[PDB]
């Protein structure tokens, strides 16, 4: 996995995109560069050993949607270290760093069935106290949690389900 090697590159890209007030452009550029990495024939090229500057020059050529100096420079550096495969994760960590920078969050709400459209408003109102961040509740359904709700925000979950209560009771006995 590339999560541990994507961290420096994501932090550098974000530290740069902040100073030039180009976060919104960098994110789209990184998303495109990550999508090319997923292509059938390109991924074949990225494995077989090839001199980094030649691999980067072949990679740049496939991206006219990259800003003239800094995006291509990032690609060159990563190609030198041989980490172009890490891009799909440099994107993840770029978005996460942005969410931290803009004090924003995004939380799952898992329910037996959809909510009252004011229950969403009350959930968000509550959450923006637990979290300083502005929240977007993207909602889901799962009838195995036959009643109540699960709220998941990152690696924190608040389990208000009936299924949860039953599993918690059945082990107290």
């Amino acid at each position: 996995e590339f999560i541990t090697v994507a961290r420096p590159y994501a932090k550098a890209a974000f530290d740069f995109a902040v100073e030039h007030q180009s976060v919104e452009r960098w994110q789209d550029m990184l998303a495109f560069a990550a999508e090319v990495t997923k292509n059938e024939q390109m991924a074949e090229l990225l494995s077989g050993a090839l001199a980094p500057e030649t691999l980067a020059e072949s990679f740049i050529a496939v991206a006219g949607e990259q800003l003239d100096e800094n995006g291509q420079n990032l690609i060159r550096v990563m190609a030198e270290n041989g980490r172009l495969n890490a891009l799909p994760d440099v994107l993840e960590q770029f978005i996460h760093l942005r969410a931290v920078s803009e004090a924003t969050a995004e939380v799952d709400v898992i329910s037996a069935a959809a909510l009252s459209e004011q229950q969403l408003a009350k959930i968000s109102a509550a959450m923006e106290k637990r979290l300083s961040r502005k929240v977007k509740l993207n909602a889901k359904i799962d009838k195995s949690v036959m009643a109540g709700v699960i709220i998941r925000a990152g690696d924190m979950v608040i389990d208000g389900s009936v299924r949860g209560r039953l599993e918690r009771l059945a082990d107290v006995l």
Binding site: T4, R152, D155, M156, G164, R165, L169, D171, V172
Partner: protein, 513 residues
């Protein structure tokens, strides 16, 4: 009678009553890998080292590494059914184990979960499995005696309350026999016992449990079991779960006794867990810290002065002093006492009882080899009478057992060696003792009397064994009040010397044997 439906129903109804319907917020992660017993978890941004991570099913994994992006943990149980992508929960708990005197008589898994059929535990809360032993100022010097059932160790190798005494020998030499004879003998002397079996065969554990229940000791012991089948992460963490329960009595000013059966197998399970984490091995392929593993465990066995008890117990227990004796058992290949693990433990404990296969196969049982075995506290631990009657006996036999070497063909100093060599031989023939036959301080004292004061060199070497069986009934019939006094107090005076001379003269003269 005691299958009353109503009591079961109320037992459950209580649980329904005190059930917190309120939810709770917890921290979560996903399993990313599984192999040979080790887990790799993403997330858990709030897991703390040594923590218990809770898996699907009802089982736990212990966090060993908090790397930059992943938590490394060992599964404490069967791990085959865990699959990548399963969720896990971070409990707030460093590794914990139930403790209390309500465990006494129960047979317990290394996590406290009972393994006999007799249902849930009654326990006085929980205690942390990994703790640091009392410091240098909180100790007190070991003073009081712990009686085993045996002549050979109670005379030559005395054990005090708060001492750590290694039992080391070859395999099938009577190590476990001597240990569970120590446990049986505290059946009535007020110190609670714990027997933690690591890597044993399951049948053998059920057999020792059967003997413990058969001699009436079981109601006074806790039995911790992690058998040869169970995952290495259970075996290597077993004895810490035993010390966590022993330390419950040490801190309340009471006394305990704990037996780690084959710390060798704990070292082997830890070597496994270590090598599966790619750690560089060292000598004999053991990890670098295989010493510290035993060091931080045996060091918990200690005796603590009364101020530590009063401070720990918030002033509820006054003036008393607690202790936790420990008898680790080590197995050595081919009688080699110089290997990396046997030496590591000889360097941690306060002595060793070395059981020799050559004596054991010759019929001398218990096969205590004097000369290698020692007690690093020595006489401070003995009752007043025993420290007198013992003399320097252990070096007496350690000499007789090389006079017996050179006297295999020819020798000088003839007639003095004659009597040295006869005393040694009838003494060794006297120190051998049957299994499950513990003899009290009063029963053992008059026999050592009969040993050192002559009353010997006339009776036949074959008759030594029945001289004893007759004498211990003669004094059980007639002079019973004197046995009753010597049992109650160590009691050494020259009134008791006179009474013992009189009893032994009258026996020697009047009775047949």
């Amino acid at each position: 009678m005691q299958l009353n439906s109503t009591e079961i129903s109320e037992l459950i109804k209580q649980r329904i009553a005190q059930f917190n319907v309120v939810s709770e917020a917890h921290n979560e992660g996903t399993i990313v890998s599984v192999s040979d017993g080790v887990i790799r978890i993403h997330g858990l941004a709030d897991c703390m080292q040594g923590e218990m991570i809770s898996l699907p099913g009802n089982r736990y994994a212990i966090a060993l590494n908090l790397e930059r992006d992943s938590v490394g943990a060992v599964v404490m149980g069967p791990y085959a059914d865990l699959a990548e992508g399963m969720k896990v929960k971070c409990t707030g708990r460093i590794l914990e184990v139930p403790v209390g005197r309500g465990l006494l008589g129960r047979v317990v898994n290394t996590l406290g979960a009972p393994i006999d059929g007799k249902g849930p535990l009654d326990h006085d809360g929980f205690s942390a499995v990994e703790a640091i032993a009392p410091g240098v100022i909180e100790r007190q010097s070991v003073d009081q005696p712990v009686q085993t059932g045996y002549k050979a160790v109670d005379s030559m190798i005395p054990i005090g309350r708060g001492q750590r005494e290694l039992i080391i020998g070859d395999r099938q030499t009577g190590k476990t026999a001597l240990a569970i004879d120590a446990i049986i003998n505290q059946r009535d002397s007020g110190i609670k016992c714990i027997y933690v079996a690591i890597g044993q065969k399951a049948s053998t554990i059920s057999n020792v449990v059967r003997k413990l229940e058969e001699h009436g000791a079981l109601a006074n012991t806790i039995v911790v079991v992690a058998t040869a089948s169970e995952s290495a992460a259970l075996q290597y963490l077993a004895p810490y779960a035993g010390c966590a329960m022993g330390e419950y009595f040490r801190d309340r000013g009471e006394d305990a006794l704990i037996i780690y059966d084959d710390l060798s197998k704990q070292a082997v399970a830890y070597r496994q867990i270590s090598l599966l984490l790619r750690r560089p091995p060292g000598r004999e392929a053991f990890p670098g810290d295989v010493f510290y593993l035993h060091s931080r465990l045996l060091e918990r066995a200690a005796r603590v002065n009364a101020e530590y008890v009063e401070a720990f117990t918030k002033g509820e227990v006054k003036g008393k002093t607690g202790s936790l004796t420990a008898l680790p058992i080590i197995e050595t290949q081919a009688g080699d006492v110089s290997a990396f693990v046997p030496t590591n433990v000889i360097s941690i404990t306060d002595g060793q009882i070395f059981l020799e296969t050559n004596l054991f196969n010759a019929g001398i049982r218990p096969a205590v080899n004097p000369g290698i075995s020692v007690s690093r506290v020595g006489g401070a631990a003995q009752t007043k009478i025993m420290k007198k009657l013992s003399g320097g006996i252990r070096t007496a036999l350690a000499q007789y057992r090389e006079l017996a070497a050179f006297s295999q063909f020819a020798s000088d100093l003839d007639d003095a060696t004659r009597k040295q060599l006869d005393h040694g031989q009838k003494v060794t023939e006297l120190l051998k003792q049957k299994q499950y036959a513990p003899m009290s301080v009063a029963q053992q004292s008059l026999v050592l009397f009969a040993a050192e004061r002559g009353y010997l060199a006339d009776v036949e070497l074959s008759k030594i064994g029945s001289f004893e069986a007759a004498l211990l009934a003669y004094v059980d019939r007639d002079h019973a009040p004197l046995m009753q006094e010597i049992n109650q107090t160590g009691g050494y005076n020259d009134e008791i010397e006179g009474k013992l001379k009189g009893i032994l003269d009258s026996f020697k003269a009047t009775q047949s044997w």
